[PDB]
Amino acid sequence: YNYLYRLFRKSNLKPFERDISTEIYQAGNKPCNGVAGFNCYFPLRSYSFRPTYGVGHQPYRVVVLSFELLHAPATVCGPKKSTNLVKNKCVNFNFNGLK
Amino acid sequence: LTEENAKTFLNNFNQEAEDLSYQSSLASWNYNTNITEENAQKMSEAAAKWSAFYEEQSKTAQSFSLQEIQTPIIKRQLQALQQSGSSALSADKNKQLNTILNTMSTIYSTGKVCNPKNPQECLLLEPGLDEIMATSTDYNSRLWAWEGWRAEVGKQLRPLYEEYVVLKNEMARANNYNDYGDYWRGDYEAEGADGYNYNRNQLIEDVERTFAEIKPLYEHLHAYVRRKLMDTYPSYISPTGCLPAHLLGDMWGRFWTNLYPLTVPFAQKPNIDVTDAMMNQGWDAERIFQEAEKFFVSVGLPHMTQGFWANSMLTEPADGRKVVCHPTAWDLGHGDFRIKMCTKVTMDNFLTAHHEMGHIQYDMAYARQPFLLRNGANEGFHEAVGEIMSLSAATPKHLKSIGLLPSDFQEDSETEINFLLKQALTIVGTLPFTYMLEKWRWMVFRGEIPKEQWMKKWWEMKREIVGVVEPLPHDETYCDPASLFHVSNDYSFIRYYTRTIYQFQFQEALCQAAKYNGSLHKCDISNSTEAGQKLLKMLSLGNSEPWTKALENVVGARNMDVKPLLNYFQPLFDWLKEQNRNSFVGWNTEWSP
Ligand SMILES: *[C@@H]1O[C@H](CO)[C@@H](O)[C@H](O)[C@H]1NC(C)=O
Ligand SMILES: *[C@@H]1O[C@H](CO)[C@@H](O)[C@H](O)[C@H]1NC(C)=O
């Protein structure tokens, strides 16, 4: 019961926006005043994960990698291909861009 | 706006209802596969919390007015939620009704009927009396057990039924119903669209219309069974009279399937039993359920889930835990589908595994529906979609395809006729009993039968409709219906009638989809994906639509049709014509011995 999700919200989320608010969702015309009930729902509902669920309801962990480029120098640059070194022979060399 | 409030209310209700229903269903599964006091009490608070949550949400759901709701799925969900049931009463009257129901259950489960001058061999029904009705051939011992169970139930259950009728009528009229039979008939009510409108008061006349032409087939079958029982009992049964109530193979005459050794056409021809072929090839319960899954993926239904194989018990565990021998398919929620079965290596358990996997596929198909619409279209659809799989699994073609029956099998007409007669004794013989019992319950709850004219009315209609006479006269101190399990535990009985009709309707629809050019009873729906798609057009619906629309989606009709039932039994009906020329088809209401 430690995994929650938001089921009710007044307006749709903007991209890469979070909402950690626990304000009571007013679905009607009467003011909620912080107390749940009829037409007054708590927005956070629990992902009651159990190991005997079906595959469409079993918990899935998701990591979203978002890549951005800015005017700054791009300092996240992954592995570069390297081959073995051969000496005493006329070969085409390329070290750090220098060919 | 009211409809958006109802949408947000249903959105808030659905997830908590799914969670609490899963907890209640998991506690019930933990009790049913592991019987102890801790699992029983865990089931008790789980069911109490789930029922209390359902009722407190239904009180809020009754505040919505359905005259300004345009979306029919939201209106159907709010119709399903607003069924309060027995909670509409006061606390005293509800406590009295629950006390009466629970003491009926505990007096039916522990009723004991035993012998003059022999008190020591004193028997419950469940180990011994069903064996006496199924096996014994002595007339006086059956008259003993029948009259004793009628006495030792009816004398104790007549006044309990007297207040039971009044309190159930008050329960129905607190929910704006005419009577408790009308409350049961409100499960068949359909309100959506135009041309799909079905009413409660229509249902009774539809049942009578569908009983108007099963009656010649039942009359011929009754005449043949009466003649074979006259061969069995020489002078105790009249040729023109009705059958005695204690010679029908059951406690009540509900199923005639125990009369098959007595009423066999051809005793020298064996049955289509393939149990010994399973024992010779070393089959177990896992291979039975894998062959059922192979059948369902051959017809086009999806595979079984991994949690189905992981969590179901398919064998007697023998680990010291008590289990219920009754097979049951469980839809626990959140994609959890299980089967509780004590599978022996038999053909009957193979067909029962196909039946419960039909239940499992029915539960799996409407999982995409909302929680309040995850039911059958009506009460007959859920068992009909298992009975069609039980029909298709028993064919000689399916057993020859999977190697259970040899390839050089010659299926002559004699074993086909006696297979069809066994199916008729199981299937056709329960229909006048079902129509009688539900007609009597509807007339008692409506008040069409006066209170002091109960028993003699009942034995009138059994002299009239079913064609079965009482062995001894009964006065109004008896309560002769109440000896049955379904009426002493508050269960609807017309679901078996609608099951029987929808079963053969679905069977003709799936065999016309599979393009089978032979007779209906030889038809196999295996290796036919278009029949599976025609089936999944209905199974994916749930009760989101009216049941007439789902019925038109399968068979192209909007009502019950028994022409498929007479077309299934057509060679047998011709055979029953061929051996009833000299006999008298029909019965006399006057008591003939
Ligand atoms: C059945 O219930 C008892 C109750 O304590 C428990 O000890 C046992 O482990 C249960 N069996 C299974 C298979 O879970
Ligand atoms: C249906 O397909 C299965 C798949 O192996 C096959 O074994 C079976 O013989 C087929 N049935 C018919 C009637 O061809």
XYZ file of C-alpha atoms and ligand atoms in Angstrom:
720
model
C 0.000 0.000 0.000
C 3.029 2.296 -0.438
C 2.479 2.829 -4.198
C -0.045 5.543 -5.071
C -1.436 7.238 -8.175
C -3.582 10.262 -8.988
C -7.035 9.370 -10.313
C -8.741 12.783 -10.121
C -7.449 16.180 -11.243
C -9.107 19.416 -12.374
C -7.001 19.799 -15.541
C -4.591 17.678 -17.553
C -0.882 17.606 -16.756
C 1.629 19.565 -18.791
C 4.622 17.537 -20.070
C 7.274 16.823 -17.396
C 5.045 18.256 -14.655
C 4.503 16.734 -11.213
C 1.685 17.176 -8.701
C 2.325 16.004 -5.132
C -0.708 17.833 -3.708
C -3.197 15.978 -1.497
C -6.037 18.495 -1.859
C -9.485 16.883 -1.859
C -10.961 16.690 -5.362
C -14.293 18.529 -5.490
C -16.384 16.727 -8.112
C -19.617 18.580 -7.337
C -20.892 21.981 -6.222
C -20.740 21.678 -2.429
C -17.377 22.667 -0.890
C -15.369 19.720 0.386
C -13.669 21.590 3.297
C -11.039 18.867 3.588
C -13.501 16.079 4.480
C -14.149 13.260 2.019
C -17.509 11.660 1.284
C -20.019 12.095 -1.533
C -18.732 14.222 -4.455
C -15.528 14.749 -2.409
C -12.745 12.266 -3.153
C -9.149 11.918 -2.010
C -7.074 12.148 -5.221
C -4.397 9.562 -4.330
C -5.411 5.904 -4.691
C -3.244 2.968 -3.672
C -1.654 0.468 -6.071
C -2.419 -2.510 -3.822
C 0.144 -4.825 -5.405
C -0.169 -8.550 -4.661
C 1.901 -11.378 -6.199
C -1.128 -13.385 -7.413
C -2.447 -10.669 -9.751
C -2.757 -10.984 -13.497
C 0.076 -9.759 -15.705
C -1.718 -6.555 -16.703
C -2.035 -5.608 -13.017
C 1.376 -6.814 -11.791
C 3.796 -3.998 -10.853
C 6.128 -2.686 -13.552
C 9.078 -0.421 -12.777
C 9.608 2.279 -15.419
C 12.661 4.486 -16.003
C 12.291 7.255 -18.601
C 15.569 8.611 -19.983
C 15.050 12.068 -21.504
C 17.940 13.556 -23.479
C 18.303 17.308 -23.949
C 20.787 19.432 -25.890
C 21.351 23.058 -24.905
C 23.818 25.829 -25.752
C 26.158 24.297 -23.150
C 28.891 21.882 -24.313
C 27.454 18.358 -24.432
C 29.264 16.700 -21.526
C 27.316 13.413 -21.436
C 28.936 11.368 -24.198
C 29.012 7.577 -24.048
C 31.683 5.016 -24.998
C 33.720 5.493 -28.167
C 34.868 2.512 -30.235
C 38.472 1.453 -29.637
C 40.429 -1.302 -31.367
C 43.698 -2.962 -30.389
C 46.970 -1.111 -30.929
C 49.366 -2.360 -33.613
C 52.932 -1.064 -33.611
C 55.840 -0.986 -36.090
C 53.507 -0.999 -39.122
C 52.110 1.733 -41.363
C 48.499 2.013 -40.179
C 45.787 4.672 -40.193
C 45.690 6.259 -36.739
C 42.933 8.354 -35.152
C 43.474 9.585 -31.586
C 40.871 11.976 -30.083
C 39.761 13.123 -33.521
C 43.295 13.589 -34.867
C 43.663 11.371 -37.948
C -23.854 18.077 -14.015
C -25.274 14.811 -12.670
C -23.784 12.395 -15.226
C -20.223 13.639 -14.660
C -20.764 13.301 -10.899
C -21.881 9.706 -11.482
C -18.817 9.087 -13.676
C -16.439 10.361 -10.982
C -18.358 8.411 -8.313
C -18.024 5.199 -10.337
C -14.333 5.939 -10.971
C -13.764 6.326 -7.226
C -15.896 3.254 -6.431
C -14.377 0.819 -8.972
C -10.825 0.522 -7.617
C -11.826 0.136 -3.956
C -14.555 -2.327 -4.958
C -11.974 -4.334 -6.927
C -9.552 -4.320 -3.973
C -12.134 -5.325 -1.354
C -13.734 -7.896 -3.677
C -10.287 -9.391 -4.291
C -9.690 -9.566 -0.526
C -13.093 -11.220 0.039
C -12.624 -13.649 -2.867
C -9.079 -14.509 -1.752
C -10.302 -15.185 1.792
C -13.089 -17.371 0.375
C -10.516 -19.247 -1.744
C -8.268 -19.662 1.307
C -11.206 -21.119 3.222
C -12.350 -23.355 0.356
C -8.948 -24.976 -0.296
C -7.868 -24.928 3.381
C -10.731 -25.420 5.835
C -9.972 -24.188 9.352
C -11.399 -21.750 11.885
C -8.867 -19.000 11.069
C -9.693 -19.036 7.349
C -13.416 -19.138 8.205
C -13.193 -16.063 10.420
C -10.927 -14.241 7.937
C -13.606 -14.909 5.313
C -16.193 -13.624 7.823
C -14.633 -10.178 8.336
C -13.585 -9.991 4.652
C -17.171 -10.586 3.494
C -18.484 -8.271 6.234
C -16.221 -5.381 5.175
C -16.954 -5.956 1.473
C -20.727 -6.108 2.060
C -20.663 -3.018 4.300
C -18.652 -1.074 1.703
C -21.022 -2.186 -1.082
C -24.085 -1.126 0.915
C -22.674 2.255 1.962
C -21.754 2.966 -1.660
C -25.206 1.801 -2.802
C -26.910 4.229 -0.394
C -24.958 7.069 -2.013
C -25.614 5.658 -5.503
C -29.380 5.683 -4.872
C -29.198 9.489 -4.554
C -28.588 9.774 -8.310
C -31.644 10.221 -10.527
C -31.483 8.129 -13.694
C -33.870 10.319 -15.726
C -31.047 12.729 -16.672
C -28.384 10.096 -17.458
C -27.924 9.585 -21.199
C -24.926 7.237 -21.387
C -26.286 3.657 -21.190
C -23.149 2.054 -19.705
C -23.144 4.522 -16.785
C -26.903 3.998 -16.372
C -26.415 0.212 -16.377
C -23.614 0.502 -13.797
C -25.826 2.646 -11.564
C -28.668 0.152 -12.043
C -26.332 -2.649 -10.943
C -25.110 -0.644 -7.935
C -28.570 0.442 -6.731
C -29.740 -3.131 -6.057
C -29.804 -2.921 -2.256
C -31.353 -6.364 -1.801
C -32.287 -7.342 1.745
C -30.782 -4.193 3.327
C -33.910 -2.135 2.511
C -35.667 -3.497 5.627
C -35.380 -2.609 9.302
C -32.711 -4.237 11.468
C -35.229 -6.464 13.284
C -36.859 -7.827 10.123
C -33.493 -8.324 8.395
C -32.172 -10.126 11.485
C -35.271 -12.353 11.526
C -34.870 -13.151 7.811
C -31.145 -13.910 8.204
C -31.912 -16.109 11.229
C -34.572 -18.000 9.243
C -32.211 -18.471 6.273
C -29.304 -19.634 8.454
C -31.454 -22.065 10.440
C -32.848 -23.396 7.140
C -29.272 -23.973 5.945
C -28.230 -25.672 9.193
C -31.354 -27.854 9.299
C -30.958 -28.890 5.647
C -27.264 -29.696 6.107
C -27.834 -31.769 9.277
C -31.204 -33.408 8.588
C -31.340 -37.094 9.499
C -33.928 -39.624 8.293
C -33.884 -43.166 9.636
C -35.780 -46.414 9.962
C -38.651 -47.986 11.904
C -37.249 -50.600 14.366
C -33.645 -49.976 13.164
C -32.429 -46.726 14.781
C -28.676 -47.406 14.792
C -27.896 -47.108 11.048
C -29.101 -43.544 10.952
C -28.241 -41.552 7.898
C -27.580 -38.120 6.460
C -28.689 -37.486 2.882
C -25.269 -36.617 1.424
C -23.412 -39.943 2.090
C -26.342 -42.337 2.020
C -29.722 -41.211 0.693
C -28.446 -40.026 -2.682
C -26.815 -43.464 -2.976
C -30.172 -45.084 -2.133
C -31.923 -42.996 -4.798
C -29.171 -43.665 -7.357
C -28.482 -47.377 -6.810
C -31.250 -49.196 -4.912
C -33.969 -51.059 -6.803
C -36.281 -52.024 -3.911
C -39.635 -50.228 -4.075
C -40.294 -50.185 -0.318
C -36.839 -48.845 0.617
C -37.261 -45.969 -1.830
C -40.793 -45.329 -0.514
C -39.238 -45.352 2.985
C -36.532 -42.819 2.152
C -38.810 -40.549 0.090
C -41.673 -40.389 2.606
C -39.255 -40.079 5.521
C -37.312 -37.189 4.008
C -40.589 -35.511 2.986
C -41.859 -35.838 6.573
C -38.608 -35.011 8.438
C -38.137 -31.892 6.272
C -41.654 -30.606 5.541
C -43.026 -30.922 9.090
C -40.120 -28.792 10.352
C -39.963 -26.369 7.401
C -43.643 -25.565 6.746
C -43.973 -22.618 9.226
C -40.412 -21.513 8.444
C -41.553 -21.229 4.827
C -44.750 -19.488 6.046
C -42.813 -16.549 7.471
C -40.100 -16.913 4.774
C -42.631 -16.089 2.030
C -43.975 -13.052 3.926
C -40.530 -11.630 4.763
C -39.262 -12.152 1.202
C -42.411 -10.462 -0.151
C -41.725 -7.536 2.203
C -38.108 -7.500 0.972
C -39.267 -7.329 -2.649
C -41.968 -4.697 -2.079
C -39.465 -2.554 -0.175
C -37.506 -2.397 -3.465
C -40.580 -1.343 -5.539
C -41.240 -4.862 -6.839
C -44.615 -6.593 -7.002
C -43.452 -9.865 -5.422
C -40.303 -11.878 -4.752
C -40.748 -13.804 -7.986
C -40.817 -10.420 -9.715
C -37.598 -9.567 -7.854
C -36.031 -12.732 -9.285
C -37.461 -11.921 -12.739
C -35.834 -8.476 -12.573
C -32.530 -10.209 -13.379
C -33.892 -10.793 -16.908
C -35.117 -7.205 -17.355
C -33.569 -5.278 -20.255
C -34.059 -1.538 -20.742
C -31.465 -0.458 -23.322
C -32.343 0.815 -26.822
C -35.501 0.064 -28.833
C -36.480 -3.463 -29.809
C -34.196 -4.828 -27.071
C -36.674 -4.029 -24.274
C -37.455 -7.074 -22.121
C -39.913 -7.042 -19.222
C -40.384 -9.183 -16.119
C -44.015 -10.065 -16.932
C -42.950 -11.114 -20.447
C -40.603 -13.792 -19.082
C -43.308 -16.139 -17.705
C -45.206 -16.202 -21.018
C -41.925 -16.711 -22.904
C -41.186 -19.718 -20.657
C -44.674 -21.113 -21.331
C -44.183 -20.582 -25.083
C -40.848 -22.414 -24.980
C -42.516 -25.156 -22.898
C -45.338 -25.524 -25.428
C -43.221 -27.553 -27.886
C -40.688 -29.322 -25.668
C -43.842 -30.992 -24.273
C -44.227 -33.638 -27.071
C -40.557 -34.668 -26.741
C -40.913 -34.845 -22.952
C -44.181 -36.783 -23.338
C -42.514 -39.369 -25.599
C -39.493 -39.609 -23.270
C -41.808 -39.973 -20.252
C -43.775 -42.728 -22.011
C -40.573 -44.627 -22.879
C -39.204 -44.234 -19.329
C -42.579 -45.349 -17.928
C -42.579 -48.448 -20.155
C -39.017 -49.367 -19.160
C -39.886 -48.861 -15.487
C -42.930 -51.089 -16.027
C -40.408 -53.618 -17.311
C -38.526 -52.974 -14.057
C -41.540 -52.757 -11.718
C -44.187 -55.189 -13.044
C -47.471 -54.153 -11.384
C -46.581 -51.031 -9.363
C -46.724 -48.623 -12.346
C -49.816 -48.097 -14.524
C -49.441 -47.831 -18.323
C -51.726 -44.786 -18.593
C -50.916 -43.321 -15.169
C -48.214 -41.039 -13.852
C -44.798 -42.113 -12.564
C -44.271 -42.511 -8.803
C -42.121 -39.795 -7.263
C -39.560 -42.161 -5.691
C -38.640 -44.155 -8.829
C -36.965 -41.309 -10.755
C -33.367 -41.936 -9.661
C -33.014 -38.799 -7.512
C -34.314 -37.603 -4.153
C -36.823 -35.316 -5.883
C -36.801 -36.395 -9.529
C -34.718 -33.388 -10.595
C -32.393 -35.441 -12.824
C -33.407 -38.668 -14.565
C -29.765 -39.589 -15.266
C -29.744 -42.441 -12.714
C -32.391 -44.277 -14.773
C -29.932 -44.985 -17.612
C -29.126 -48.631 -16.610
C -32.878 -49.194 -16.203
C -33.891 -47.429 -19.442
C -31.018 -48.373 -21.770
C -32.014 -49.045 -25.411
C -29.102 -51.374 -26.184
C -27.381 -52.925 -23.167
C -24.863 -54.850 -25.294
C -23.409 -51.624 -26.736
C -20.907 -49.908 -24.400
C -20.859 -46.191 -23.670
C -18.328 -43.615 -24.981
C -16.310 -43.773 -21.747
C -12.593 -43.189 -22.363
C -11.352 -43.337 -18.745
C -9.458 -46.612 -19.293
C -7.670 -45.045 -22.269
C -6.559 -42.226 -19.956
C -5.261 -44.767 -17.422
C -3.423 -46.758 -20.110
C -1.637 -43.648 -21.419
C -0.819 -42.387 -17.906
C -2.828 -39.164 -18.035
C -3.063 -36.938 -14.966
C -5.034 -33.805 -14.085
C -2.370 -31.479 -15.517
C -2.683 -33.189 -18.901
C -6.496 -32.947 -18.655
C -6.367 -29.187 -18.124
C -3.654 -28.833 -20.787
C -5.891 -30.662 -23.279
C -8.746 -28.344 -22.291
C -6.441 -25.360 -22.891
C -5.400 -26.912 -26.227
C -9.090 -27.146 -27.174
C -9.654 -23.509 -26.202
C -6.652 -22.253 -28.164
C -7.747 -24.415 -31.109
C -11.203 -22.808 -31.108
C -9.642 -19.331 -30.734
C -9.988 -18.509 -27.018
C -6.856 -17.113 -25.283
C -4.286 -19.122 -23.359
C -4.487 -19.671 -19.618
C -2.555 -17.233 -17.444
C 0.554 -18.193 -15.482
C -1.255 -17.375 -12.233
C -3.949 -19.879 -13.199
C -1.388 -22.690 -13.318
C 0.454 -21.361 -10.256
C -2.466 -20.807 -7.872
C -5.105 -23.423 -8.763
C -5.351 -26.735 -6.941
C -6.166 -29.532 -9.399
C -5.572 -32.599 -7.192
C -6.545 -33.826 -3.733
C -3.588 -32.358 -1.803
C -3.458 -34.997 1.009
C -1.525 -32.514 3.180
C -3.956 -32.578 6.105
C -6.041 -29.653 4.817
C -9.749 -30.212 4.228
C -11.096 -29.188 0.819
C -14.495 -28.901 -0.837
C -15.004 -31.620 -3.449
C -17.288 -29.368 -5.542
C -15.451 -27.938 -8.584
C -15.684 -24.158 -8.822
C -14.070 -21.607 -11.145
C -13.036 -18.463 -9.281
C -12.681 -14.948 -10.711
C -10.924 -13.295 -7.782
C -10.330 -9.989 -9.568
C -7.247 -8.103 -10.824
C -6.701 -10.766 -13.476
C -6.732 -13.704 -11.030
C -8.543 -16.771 -12.405
C -8.399 -20.084 -10.517
C -10.079 -23.504 -10.499
C -10.806 -25.516 -7.341
C -11.271 -29.126 -8.432
C -10.504 -32.520 -6.890
C -9.696 -34.052 -10.262
C -9.679 -37.814 -10.598
C -8.548 -39.338 -13.894
C -12.030 -39.882 -15.358
C -13.974 -38.771 -18.422
C -16.534 -36.951 -16.252
C -13.807 -34.902 -14.560
C -12.399 -34.181 -18.039
C -15.764 -32.756 -19.131
C -16.041 -30.901 -15.807
C -12.577 -29.407 -16.418
C -13.785 -28.211 -19.831
C -16.904 -26.758 -18.156
C -14.929 -24.856 -15.516
C -12.414 -23.662 -18.120
C -15.432 -22.361 -20.040
C -16.353 -20.477 -16.862
C -12.757 -19.221 -16.615
C -12.729 -18.003 -20.234
C -16.095 -16.287 -19.671
C -14.638 -14.520 -16.622
C -11.429 -13.655 -18.513
C -13.207 -12.149 -21.511
C -15.151 -9.408 -19.705
C -12.146 -8.365 -17.585
C -11.886 -5.196 -19.707
C -15.358 -4.143 -18.515
C -15.902 -2.004 -15.394
C -16.354 -3.803 -12.083
C -20.145 -3.567 -11.876
C -20.473 -5.039 -15.387
C -18.163 -8.021 -14.784
C -21.025 -10.520 -14.625
C -23.022 -12.635 -17.023
C -25.616 -11.147 -19.352
C -28.130 -12.954 -17.173
C -27.907 -15.901 -14.782
C -28.212 -18.484 -17.576
C -25.413 -17.203 -19.831
C -22.608 -18.019 -17.373
C -23.532 -21.689 -17.116
C -24.568 -21.962 -20.795
C -21.099 -20.924 -21.977
C -19.664 -23.769 -19.893
C -22.285 -26.284 -20.986
C -21.425 -25.656 -24.646
C -17.803 -26.601 -23.892
C -19.067 -29.668 -22.021
C -21.082 -30.496 -25.155
C -18.133 -30.088 -27.530
C -15.636 -31.932 -25.305
C -17.738 -35.125 -25.234
C -17.974 -35.731 -28.991
C -16.292 -38.810 -30.536
C -14.592 -36.507 -33.075
C -12.745 -34.564 -30.356
C -11.689 -37.770 -28.588
C -10.487 -39.292 -31.865
C -8.562 -36.100 -32.687
C -6.546 -36.021 -29.435
C -5.774 -39.757 -29.445
C -8.096 -40.678 -26.564
C -10.273 -42.691 -28.970
C -8.834 -44.861 -31.775
C -8.791 -43.741 -35.396
C -10.635 -46.860 -36.636
C -13.676 -46.130 -34.442
C -17.020 -47.042 -36.018
C -19.810 -44.884 -34.574
C -22.971 -46.850 -35.269
C -26.445 -45.518 -34.550
C -27.074 -47.618 -31.414
C -24.448 -45.975 -29.206
C -25.424 -42.596 -30.675
C -29.061 -43.166 -29.665
C -28.218 -44.279 -26.135
C -25.762 -41.375 -25.724
C -28.565 -39.032 -26.835
C -30.953 -40.725 -24.402
C -28.503 -40.289 -21.512
C -28.192 -36.623 -22.519
C -32.001 -36.363 -22.615
C -32.356 -37.893 -19.134
C -29.751 -35.423 -17.862
C -30.996 -32.410 -19.825
C -34.598 -32.725 -21.072
C -35.931 -34.405 -17.912
C -35.006 -31.485 -15.642
C -37.004 -28.948 -17.693
C -40.612 -29.729 -16.555
C -39.301 -30.014 -12.979
C -37.605 -26.608 -13.296
C -40.629 -24.947 -14.928
C -42.912 -26.478 -12.271
C -40.741 -25.357 -9.346
C -40.332 -21.802 -10.613
C -44.033 -21.552 -11.559
C -45.033 -22.708 -8.067
C -42.612 -20.275 -6.417
C -43.872 -17.409 -8.612
C -47.510 -18.197 -7.781
C -46.752 -18.501 -4.044
C -44.790 -15.229 -3.930
C -47.362 -13.426 -6.104
C -50.227 -14.710 -3.948
C -52.037 -16.508 -6.782
C -51.972 -19.685 -4.656
C -53.874 -19.216 -1.356
C -51.996 -19.957 1.852
C -54.186 -22.906 2.923
C -54.201 -24.499 -0.568
C -50.452 -25.061 -1.009
C -49.769 -28.808 -1.040
C -52.806 -30.055 -2.994
C -52.064 -27.398 -5.625
C -48.486 -28.640 -5.910
C -49.545 -32.239 -6.403
C -52.152 -30.980 -8.909
C -49.503 -29.415 -11.104
C -47.247 -32.451 -10.717
C -50.228 -34.499 -11.901
C -50.621 -31.948 -14.735
C -47.245 -30.545 -15.844
C -44.501 -33.002 -14.888
C -46.773 -36.047 -15.014
C -45.618 -37.522 -11.689
C -48.116 -38.657 -9.047
C -47.535 -38.805 -5.305
C -47.161 -42.274 -3.751
C -49.051 -41.274 -0.603
C -51.491 -38.400 0.025
C -50.026 -35.328 1.720
C -51.935 -32.750 3.758
C -50.989 -29.098 4.331
C -48.755 -29.909 7.315
C -46.140 -31.016 4.757
C -43.783 -28.698 2.862
C -42.797 -30.893 -0.096
C -40.885 -28.328 -2.275
C -38.649 -27.380 0.698
C -36.877 -30.774 0.567
C -34.810 -29.373 -2.341
C -31.454 -27.649 -1.798
C -32.051 -24.605 -4.022
C -35.286 -23.504 -2.338
C -34.137 -23.982 1.282
C -31.049 -21.824 0.565
C -32.753 -19.015 -1.441
C -31.578 -19.711 -4.994
C -33.193 -18.916 -8.331
C -34.031 -22.053 -10.302
C -35.004 -20.748 -13.777
C -31.306 -20.318 -14.624
C -31.165 -24.056 -15.413
C -34.082 -23.704 -17.858
C -32.484 -20.710 -19.574
C -29.125 -22.543 -19.454
C -30.677 -25.484 -21.302
C -32.236 -23.239 -23.965
C -29.172 -20.999 -24.464
C -26.865 -24.048 -24.566
C -28.389 -25.510 -27.714
C -28.950 -22.035 -29.211
C -25.222 -21.318 -28.784
C -24.409 -24.803 -30.088
C -26.297 -24.241 -33.354
C -24.718 -20.782 -33.672
C -21.182 -22.126 -33.188
C -21.760 -25.118 -35.475
C -23.205 -22.891 -38.207
C -20.172 -20.646 -37.703
C -17.820 -23.640 -37.991
C -19.648 -24.847 -41.171
C -20.492 -28.337 -39.915
C -22.646 -30.230 -42.412
C -23.753 -33.124 -40.185
C -26.112 -33.560 -37.264
C -25.850 -31.163 -34.331
C -24.989 -33.723 -31.649
C -21.937 -34.951 -33.598
C -20.642 -31.396 -34.090
C -17.187 -30.326 -32.905
C -16.155 -26.657 -32.873
C -12.411 -27.428 -32.785
C -10.003 -25.834 -35.317
C -12.563 -23.100 -36.140
C -11.328 -19.574 -35.396
C -14.426 -17.875 -36.842
C -16.626 -19.680 -34.305
C -14.238 -18.406 -31.640
C -14.606 -14.841 -32.924
C -18.411 -15.218 -33.020
C -18.195 -16.454 -29.422
C -15.842 -13.662 -28.270
C -18.231 -11.061 -29.693
C -20.563 -12.112 -26.851
C -18.053 -13.054 -24.127
C -16.299 -9.677 -24.341
C -19.593 -7.834 -23.742
C -20.393 -8.867 -20.186
C -23.645 -7.267 -19.097
C -22.648 -3.899 -20.581
C -25.422 -4.420 -23.160
C -28.894 -5.987 -22.815
C -28.879 -9.780 -23.053
C -31.169 -9.693 -26.107
C -28.423 -7.856 -28.015
C -25.823 -10.455 -26.990
C -28.244 -13.238 -27.953
C -28.756 -11.609 -31.364
C -24.963 -11.288 -31.627
C -24.619 -15.066 -31.239
C -27.698 -16.691 -32.769
C -29.487 -13.865 -34.591
C -32.535 -13.985 -32.303
C -33.752 -11.786 -29.452
C -35.591 -14.417 -27.392
C -35.457 -18.000 -26.165
C -35.670 -20.579 -28.965
C -36.092 -24.336 -28.463
C -35.898 -25.331 -32.132
C -32.125 -25.937 -31.561
C -33.042 -28.246 -28.663
C -35.441 -30.276 -30.814
C -32.893 -30.279 -33.657
C -30.224 -31.682 -31.304
C -32.511 -34.536 -30.208
C -34.017 -35.170 -33.676
C -32.667 -38.758 -34.229
C -33.693 -39.586 -30.661
C -37.114 -37.958 -31.182
C -37.581 -40.051 -34.341
C -36.532 -43.156 -32.376
C -39.001 -42.270 -29.603
C -41.721 -41.995 -32.245
C -40.647 -45.388 -33.602
C -41.102 -47.168 -30.233
C -44.263 -45.386 -29.022
C -46.762 -46.522 -31.674
C -48.431 -49.193 -29.519
C -48.056 -47.283 -26.239
C -50.054 -44.346 -24.863
C -48.180 -41.037 -25.027
C -49.413 -38.794 -22.228
C -50.629 -39.247 -18.674
C -53.859 -39.073 -16.686
C -54.194 -36.717 -13.722
C -56.359 -39.245 -11.854
C -54.239 -41.417 -9.548
C -53.449 -44.701 -11.291
C -51.114 -47.138 -9.411
C -3.570 -24.205 5.780
O -3.887 -23.465 6.985
C -3.003 -23.701 8.094
C -3.523 -22.880 9.250
O -2.473 -22.498 10.130
C -1.568 -23.342 7.707
O -0.698 -23.670 8.785
C -1.153 -24.099 6.452
O 0.143 -23.684 6.039
C -2.150 -23.855 5.320
N -1.779 -24.616 4.138
C -1.326 -24.046 3.017
C -0.987 -24.981 1.896
O -1.194 -22.831 2.912
C -6.689 -29.180 -34.921
O -5.328 -28.705 -34.723
C -4.499 -29.563 -33.921
C -3.166 -28.867 -33.773
O -2.102 -29.804 -33.668
C -4.387 -30.932 -34.582
O -3.602 -31.790 -33.760
C -5.776 -31.527 -34.783
O -5.678 -32.775 -35.459
C -6.663 -30.573 -35.584
N -8.004 -31.119 -35.720
C -8.529 -31.481 -36.896
C -9.925 -32.025 -36.851
O -7.906 -31.375 -37.947
